[PDB]
Structure 1
Amino acid sequence: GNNLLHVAVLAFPFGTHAAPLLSLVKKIATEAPKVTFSFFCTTTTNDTLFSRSNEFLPNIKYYNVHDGLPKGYVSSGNPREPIFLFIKAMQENFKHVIDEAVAETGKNITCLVTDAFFWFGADLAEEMHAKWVPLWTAGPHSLLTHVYTDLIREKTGSKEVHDVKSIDVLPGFPELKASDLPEGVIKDIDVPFATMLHKMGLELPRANAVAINSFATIHPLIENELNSKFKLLLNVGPFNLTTPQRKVSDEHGCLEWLDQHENSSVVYISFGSVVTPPPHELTALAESLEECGFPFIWSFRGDPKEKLPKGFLERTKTKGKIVAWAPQVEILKHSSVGVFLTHSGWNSVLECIVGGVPMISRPFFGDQGLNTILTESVLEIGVGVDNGVLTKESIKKALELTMSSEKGGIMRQKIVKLKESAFKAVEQNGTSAMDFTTLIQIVTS
């Protein structure tokens, strides 16, 4: 593109949303050095994202957007409170800062790239006579679930709303219970997050193009519907293969430690950038761990003994590891690791498909439920813990099953062939490289 183009990038501050988006942006900015990229997110998220050294692509500048929290505000109860406050004032807070970036660069916005959550991107793009390109950072099946929100509700009564009778929502997908769906589709339909997702489903067809961090082999039938709902659908993932972003950090020699172990023998544990199993769960896992023998790596959450038992800490310090932050993508590509105990967030899922490792899923929130059903029943590269909770009986059951002598192997096989499609999809010749090239064209023109 030319030196007159200005791309505004609006990222979601919570969960693993902002980093994947920034990654996509970095790939584009490298290909288009004369194009200006303005990245908007909360001060706290920007601080974490832009602390990186020479990662300073010159044509990318970040701008802090108000987090919606009132003056003096203090934690309070539920961790949902700051998310709800952000959502409630995000449109005007984004606009205020976008306005500063336009006055400062002297360049009107030509393209608005946003997390798909930002349904208001169409309206904003409209006002500035700019293009709108939202990015759904999760899977195709959940995106389509949101596009189908009204349809689902219209075919949902007292039975289904209460898990008595299952709903047939997605093509080429098992029948689901309301508890399977992301909060908001059929429950708590009124809260800000739920309203944000519904509006997104309704506004997406107005976009110039809808990008998604996924690849065409993930779900053919779902993709076809999405393809018919939007002006353009672009599969630009998996991001771990299509975009840069370093992070090859092993402050705790996990990979070396992994070297000094054999194949499919280590248990990697990670429940995302925000989750930490409840008390009865952690304690059920920690013990499940040092009773199964299985060597392991566990990404806790900074806090060590804080939640974990003292003794346990220095008793397993010989057959397993526990870190605050691990080099997950690399760990998942290591031949040592045999199973991935995850909450099935989408990013971790794409990373596991690329690494070729079987999965143990204990979903918590959002799309994790649909993701578990997708990898357990449709891709068959994983299984979920019993009851969706972590109890010593449910854990061992899963470990034993995946680390078994049959099922675990097959899953590993199924995910190796999927891994193959992933690598193929990103060759210049594949659909992901091609949709990415198109994305670049739209964003930089």
Structure 2
Amino acid sequence: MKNKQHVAIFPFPFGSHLPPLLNLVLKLAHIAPNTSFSFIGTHSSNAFLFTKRHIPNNIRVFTISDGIPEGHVPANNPIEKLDLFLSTGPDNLRKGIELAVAETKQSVTCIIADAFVTSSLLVAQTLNVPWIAFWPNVSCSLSLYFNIDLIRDKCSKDAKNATLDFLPGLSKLRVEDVPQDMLDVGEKETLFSRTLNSLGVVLPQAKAVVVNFFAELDPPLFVKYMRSKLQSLLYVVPLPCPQLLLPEIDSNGCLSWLDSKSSRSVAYVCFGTVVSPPPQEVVAVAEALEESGFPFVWALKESLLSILPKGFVERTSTRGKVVSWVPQSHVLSHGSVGVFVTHCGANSVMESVSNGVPMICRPFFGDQGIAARVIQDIWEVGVIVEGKVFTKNGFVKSLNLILVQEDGKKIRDNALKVKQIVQDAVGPHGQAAEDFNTLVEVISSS
């Protein structure tokens, strides 16, 4: 009997959403090389993932429209390109299905999609195939989308530090931690925010929701709450397949530099690639790092080097490293690094907790506030920076708290505890090993 299993994959075709979904498909393709996997991205998303990278033969790549007509020049806001792609609707997605079906000579039996591509559910219902939502964001933020009205009401009437006790297992979350686009109503509403606010109705229609995290780190009561909202909640280990890793030269020499530093002494600073921080906070970070006297690695966009204080890089050159790029995963897995100063992106938090690195948190948007709140008040593996924004005096204090002070021993200890929890979670028989097979069974039973 000919194997006719054909999984269509729909990533949210942007930056940090692309690698974790490729990582999952690679694992699925390795264990089911008889099954066809059709990865359907845009021209720019495909170039990002597959330019110089060898992929298994049962994974084929197809290209659909990015929603940007030739001639148009999107503004300098990270939402427009998202809205433009989402505006393409299911019809653009079905054009990717056409290219997949034509190539493989197989009708799609299953669809795995990033939860943000809500149009792919209509596609799944049209084809009558199971729809599997993939969730590479902050896991604990899944609960929010089932209580939008409760949250919108509380965010307008209650205090900003009021607890969201109506969320099982997430009573530490506050009004000020809630994503802004979830509260935005009317003119401020984007196609992106309207899509995210549809998750509470969209997600229960998914055959399975695959979370890119460790189930053992999430609050058990939150987990049970989500299992009560969904047909199936599956956790697959977010750690990279060796098929995903593209080994490259450490051009900056971060690791060689880190080897000359002592254990848990280095501050690693990075705000991500989507985040455009105010120049004054950028000035404040440099000022704090310099005053603190701690060794540091700061991954900073070169477009921001002119913003840096005069002589800062030159004066800190003997104890600090300011570079355009770092192999972050290798840096966070280095023993010299004592604190991760982060914007709290889901992947960065993942890499920091799995390596036992405490965090200084400055969330900017989205679900970074949820991550930061979990890091400080639940896992207790870090602190939100003093004042919610970067200042010289507040940041230095956070740096001193985590790195050297006895008042930060509970946090450094908790970071080691969490690392051990992760190491057992990724074991041969943690929850994810069982959940990975369940997902494989869903695909082979489709």
TM above 0.5, yes or no, is: yes
State the 1:282 CA deviation: 0.9
Q: Distance in 1 between matches of 2:425 and 2:173?
A: 30
Shift of 1:182: 1.3
2:10–2:112 Cα contact (<8 Å) kept: yes
CA distance in 2, matches of 1:111, 1:430: 26
Give, as a single letter, the amino acid of the residue that structure 1 aligns with 2:278.
P
For the 8 Å contact 2:163–2:171, the answer to whether it is kept is no
Alignment counterpart, residue 156 of structure 1, candidates 149, 154, 163:
154
Structure 1 runs not aligned, ≥5 long: none
Q: In the TM superposition, what is the alpha-carbon distance from 1:315 to its structure 2 partner? A: 2.8
User: Which of 178, 181, 186 matches 1:181?
Assistant: 178
Partner of 2:227: 227
Q: Helix, strand or coil for the counterpart of 2:180? A: coil
Alpha-carbon distance change, 17 to 240 in structure 1, aligned in 2, over 3 angstroms: same
- Alpha-carbon displacement from aligned partner over 1:254-282 (angstroms, at most 9, x marks no partner): 11211111011111111123224211011
Change (3 A) 1:164 1:174: closer
Q: Please show how residues 209-288 of structure 1 align to structure 2 within 5 Å.
A: 209-218=208-217, 219-237=219-237, 239-240=238-239, 244-249=243-248, 250-288=250-288
Q: CA deviation at 1:148?
A: 2.4
Give the stretch that moved more between structures: 86-95 or 10-19.
86-95
Structure 1 residue 135: Cα displacement: 0.9
| Cα pair 1:248 1:330 within 8 Å, conserved | no
Separation (CA, whole Å) in 2 of partners of 1:257 and 1:342: 21
Q: Partners of 2:235 and 2:308 in 1: how far apart?
A: 41
Counterpart residue type for residue 88 of structure 1: S
Structure 1 match to 2:293: 293
Aligned residues with identical type, % of pairs: 41
Corresponding position of 1:436 = 436
Are positions 1:391 and 2:388 aligned together? no
In structure 1, distance between residues paired with 2:295 and 2:351: 21
1:367 aligns with 2:374: no
Q: Give 1:353's aligned amino acid.
A: V
Shift in CA distance, 256/165, structure 1 to aligned 2, threshold 3 Å: closer
1:287 aligns to what SS in structure 2? Answer: helix
Query: Post-superposition shift, 1:175?
Result: 4.9
Q: Deviations over 1:373-403 (max 9, x none)?
A: 1110011001011232111122112111111
Change (3 A) 1:388 1:147: same
Quickly say closer, same or farther: Cα 1:310–1:93, change in 2 above 3 A.
Answer: farther
Residues 1:65 and 2:64 aligned together: yes
Partner residue, 1:195 = 194
What is the aligned partner in structure 2 of residue 205 from structure 1? 204
Alpha-carbon spacing, 1:241–1:420, altered in 2? closer, same or farther (3 Å): farther
Query: In 1, distance between residues paired with 2:77 and 2:120?
Result: 28
1:404 corresponds to: 404
In structure 2, list runs of 5 or more residues that go unmatched.
Answer: none
Task: Report how far residue 132 of structure 1 moved.
Answer: 1.0
Q: Secondary structure at the match of 1:348?
A: helix
CA distance in 2, matches of 1:441, 1:243: 23
Q: 2:128 corresponds to which residue?
A: 129
Check whether the contact 1:169–1:176 (CA below 8 A) recurs between aligned residues: no
2:325 matched to which residue of 1?
A: 325
Cα 1:207–1:61 change in 2 (3 A) is same
The answer to whether the Cα contact below 8 Å between 1:152 and 1:169 also exists between their aligned partners in 2 is no
User: 1:25 maps to what in 2?
Assistant: 25
1:112: Cα distance to partner?
0.5
Structure 2 SS opposite 1:439: helix
Contact 2:132/2:208 (8 A) holds in 1: yes
Match of 1:373, SS state, is helix
Matched, 1:102 2:101: yes
SS in 2 for 1:234: strand
Measure how far apart 1:407 and its partner are.
3.4
Give the whole-Å Cα distance in 2 for the aligned partners of 1:436 and 1:3: 21
CA distance in 1, matches of 2:215, 2:14: 27
1:22 maps to a residue whose letter is L
Q: Is the 8 A contact 1:141 1:170 kept in 2?
A: no
SS in structure 2 opposite 1:256? helix
Q: 1:111 to 1:306 in 2, by over 3 A?
A: farther
Q: Structure 2 vs 1, CA of residues 30 and 375 (structure 1 numbering), >3 Å: closer, same or farther?
A: same
List per-residue Cα deviations over 1:165-192 (Å, max 9, x = no partner).
Answer: 5543422323544331112322247321
Taking the aligned partners of 1:40 and 1:15, their CA distance within structure 2 comes to 15
C-alpha displacement of 1:247: 4.1
In the alignment, the residues of structure 1 paired with residue 215 and residue 429 of structure 2 have an alpha-carbon distance, to the nearest angstrom, of 14
State the AA in 1 paired with 2:97: I
For the 8 Å contact 1:241–1:426, the answer to whether it is kept is: no
Match of 1:414 in 2: 414
Per the TM alignment, residue 302 of structure 1 is displaced from its structure 2 partner at its CA by 4.5
What is the TM-score when the length of structure 1 is the normalising length? Answer: 0.93
Between the two proteins, the alignment pairs up a number of residues equal to: 441
Q: CA 1:436 to 1:273, structure 2 compared with 1: closer, same or farther past 3 Å?
A: farther
State the Cα RMSD in Å. Answer: 2.2
State how far apart, in whole Å, the 1-side matches of 2:111 and 2:9 are: 6
Per-residue CA deviation, residues 321-347 of structure 1 (Å, 9 max, x unaligned), is 122221111211111000000001111
Q: Using the TM superposition, give the Cα deviation of residue 306 of structure 1 relative to its aligned residue in structure 2, in angstroms.
A: 4.2
Tell me, what secondary structure is at the counterpart of 1:330?
Answer: helix
Q: Distance in 1 between matches of 2:149 and 2:115?
A: 18
Distance 1:244 1:408, change over 3 A: farther
Q: Distance in 2 between matches of 1:136 and 1:144?
A: 12
Q: 1:73 to 1:299 in 2, by over 3 A?
A: same
**Alpha-carbon displacement from aligned partner over 1:277-314 (angstroms, at most 9, x marks no partner):** 21101111112112211111111124363443463233
Residues 165-223 of structure 1 deviation map (CA, whole Å, 9 limit, x = unaligned) = 55434223235443311123222473212211122221211111111011222221111
Q: Single out whichever of 42-51 and 309-318 deviates more from structure 2.
A: 309-318
What is the distance in 2 between the residues matched to 1:308 and 1:389? Answer: 17
- CA 1:144–1:244 in 2, change beyond 3 Å: closer, same or farther? farther
Task: Say whether residues 1:171 and 2:168 are aligned partners.
Answer: yes
- Assess, with a 3 A threshold, how the Cα gap between structure 1 residues 138 and 396 changes in structure 2: closer, same or farther: same
In the TM superposition, what is the alpha-carbon distance from 1:50 to its structure 2 partner?
0.5
Match in the other structure for 1:93: 92
Displacement of 1:232 in angstroms is 0.9
TM-score if structure 2 supplies the norm length? 0.93
Contact 2:168 2:222 survives alignment (8 Å): yes
